[PDB]
Design an enzyme around this catalytic site. Structure first.
Site, PDB file in Angstrom:
ATOM      1  CD  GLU A 106      66.046 -84.441 -16.157  1.00  0.00           C
ATOM      2  OE1 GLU A 106      65.546 -84.468 -16.597  1.00  0.00           O
ATOM      3  OE2 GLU A 106      66.442 -84.391 -14.775  1.00  0.00           O
ATOM      4  CD  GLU A 136      71.005 -80.657 -14.686  1.00  0.00           C
ATOM      5  OE1 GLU A 136      70.312 -80.764 -14.167  1.00  0.00           O
ATOM      6  OE2 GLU A 136      71.506 -82.213 -15.660  1.00  0.00           O
ATOM      7  CG  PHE A 157      60.526 -75.666 -13.601  1.00  0.00           C
ATOM      8  CD1 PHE A 157      61.487 -76.752 -13.947  1.00  0.00           C
ATOM      9  CD2 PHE A 157      61.605 -75.063 -12.348  1.00  0.00           C
ATOM     10  CE1 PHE A 157      62.321 -77.287 -13.305  1.00  0.00           C
ATOM     11  CE2 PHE A 157      62.222 -75.965 -11.048  1.00  0.00           C
ATOM     12  CZ  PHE A 157      62.730 -76.837 -11.999  1.00  0.00           C
TER      13      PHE A 157
END
Ligand SMILES: [Mg+2]
Ligand code: NA
Ligand code: NA
Ligand code: NA
Ligand code: NA
Lengths: 409, 204
Positions: free
Chosen positions: B51, B127, B191
């Protein structure tokens, strides 16, 4: 059997136009085009002879070219003294498509330089480019979505004799039902059919009259060089007859004749004489070296059918097999025999989601039923076996979306 | 084996990775990884990071690896999962049949992604099947697809173990804590727990 199509008498001058090819090439954004017309003559070759190709849009002549005979040099022995190629420039040409069948009229005049017309031939011209690029079949630079149907030349009363009314009735119903393409399953059609498709606007797959389904294996004759001559003739003569029709966008080598070396030879022959149209053939696996388009018949959307040698993969999966890059358009799918077409939506959802799934041709347009009469002189629809014919396959001749009289199913 | 480079919080994501002034710092995170782990047979693929969008610095380093070590494919998901900096289409959370046509960086259904005009690379999700809490619904759908499509060669589930930490109450009894239980703020709470197994390795 019999003389089922028109018979005619034609008078040509001794010095005549024996052949002529019309091609249209474009610049990147289709704002400019060049129309190339190669004309061939037979008879006494003379310096005073000329050919004039004029292009008309309605009553307006948009372009014109005149030249004597004598083609450019092609090899050590010279060129074709009996041929000539006219090149005409057309700015912002009105493009042809099934959406807007814009046509121009090309007049080919064989005449003396001083103005004596010997004879004239002509044809409707559709400015359009068909090509496969990056795995997509494009028409004038845009990816097509084939909403097609296979159509046999069948009349419940006259058999395989075709007439204008019937052809028109079919075309009207097809377009009225959102169809934009038709496959000439499985042979060259009545000459009027192509004219109607050029004018009404339908993409056409012209298919050679070659099917040897009953052979064992299916390619026993097509892989035999001794049958190449009879085969090449059914392919070459088709191309020479229909190559100027804008409606024809794809050439087909036939149907269900397996895959033989003869197919590869003829596939190459067409690529050589007419590079303006993709060539397809379903035989031997739907994805052989004899086809520019993966064109399976009845391959399902999600379910694989791993038949030995000639598997029918799920269409979504077929596209991404290692090394595969061609577009996929089913030559036959959604068999409409009787109460059918269940799962049709699944095909169209896939066609719209996958760029390279570019449609297919439903099987098929009209039930092949024939009219018979009872003792009361009343008519009834008969199928296989109803004429003493045997062996036969009964009702398998009725797979249409419409009844023989064109009433919709 | 993945380089320690993630600039997710940047706007746009590639603000630093497309800047040559950051090329040096990025190169060391990639080059010193290769110089260290290149002899391990278990490492079969190099990753340029995670990312950090897609920048010119990625293309440079991608090529650097390909040049010093041709024995392992290089992959990177940033900028759309199919950029010029990856030998493998490695999307994250791309679905099996449903497309997510996000602007610029769309997540096509994996079956469709494979056959896009001109695409030929294999597809392995870096992922997928986010295992946060009561999850993994639809897992079987991925495997039915992986088995049917040759070029769909699997993926890496996200992820292995919950990132929970142990805290003790007044009684000294341990309990599992997540984001925000240490006075840390801002925080993204639970999270950090998306594992197939609890922090102590008890299966979910
Ligand atoms: Mg004149
Ligand atoms: Na499509
Ligand atoms: Na049939
Ligand atoms: Na696979
Ligand atoms: Na997380």
């Amino acid at each position: 059997s019999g003389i089922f199509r028109d018979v005619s008498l034609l008078h040509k001058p001794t010095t005549q136009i024996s052949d002529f090819h019309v091609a249209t090439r474009f610049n990147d954004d289709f704002s400019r085009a060049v129309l190339e017309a190669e004309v061939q003559m037979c008879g006494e070759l003379r310096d005073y002879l000329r050919v004039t190709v004029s292009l008309w849009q309605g009553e307006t002549q948009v372009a014109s070219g005149t030249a004597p005979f004598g083609g450019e040099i092609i090899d050590e022995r010279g060129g074709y003294a009996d041929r000539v190629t006219l090149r005409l420039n057309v700015e912002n040409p009105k493009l042809w498509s099934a959406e807007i069948p814009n046509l121009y009229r090309a007049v080919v005049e064989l005449h003396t330089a001083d103005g004596t017309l010997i004879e004239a031939e002509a044809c409707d011209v559709g400015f359009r480019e068909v090509r496969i690029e990056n795995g997509l079949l494009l028409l004038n630079g845009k990816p097509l979505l084939i909403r097609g149907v296979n159509r046999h030349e069948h009349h419940p009363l006259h058999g395989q004799v075709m007439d204008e009314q019937t052809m028109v009735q079919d075309i009207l119903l097809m377009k009225q039902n959102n169809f934009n393409a038709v496959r000439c399953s499985h042979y060259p059609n009545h000459p009027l059919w192509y004219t109607l498709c050029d004018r009404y606007g339908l993409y056409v797959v012209d298919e050679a009259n070659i099917e040897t389904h009953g052979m064992v294996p299916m390619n026993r004759l097509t892989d035999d060089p001794r049958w190449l001559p009879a085969m090449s003739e059914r392919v070459t003569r088709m191309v020479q007859r229909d190559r100027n029709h804008p409606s024809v966008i794809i050439w087909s080598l036939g149907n269900e004749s397996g895959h033989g070396a003869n197919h590869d030879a003829l596939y190459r022959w067409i690529k050589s004489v007419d590079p303006s149209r993709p060539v397809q053939y379903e035989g031997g696996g739907a994805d052989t070296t004899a086809t520019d388009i993966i064109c399976p018949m009845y391959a399902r959307v999600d379910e694989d059918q791993p038949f030995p040698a000639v598997p029918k993969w799920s269409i979504k999966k077929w596209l991404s097999l290692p090394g595969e890059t061609r577009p996929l358009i089913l030559c036959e799918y959604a068999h409409a025999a009787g109460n059918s077409l269940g799962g049709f939506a699944k095909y169209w959802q896939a066609f719209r989601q996958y760029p390279r799934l570019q449609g297919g041709f439903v099987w098929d347009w009209v039930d092949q039923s024939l009219i018979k009469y009872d003792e009361n002189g009343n008519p009834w629809s008969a199928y296989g076996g109803d004429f003493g014919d045997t062996p036969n396959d009964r009702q398998f001749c009725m797979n249409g979306l419409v009844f023989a009289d064109r009433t919709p199913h």
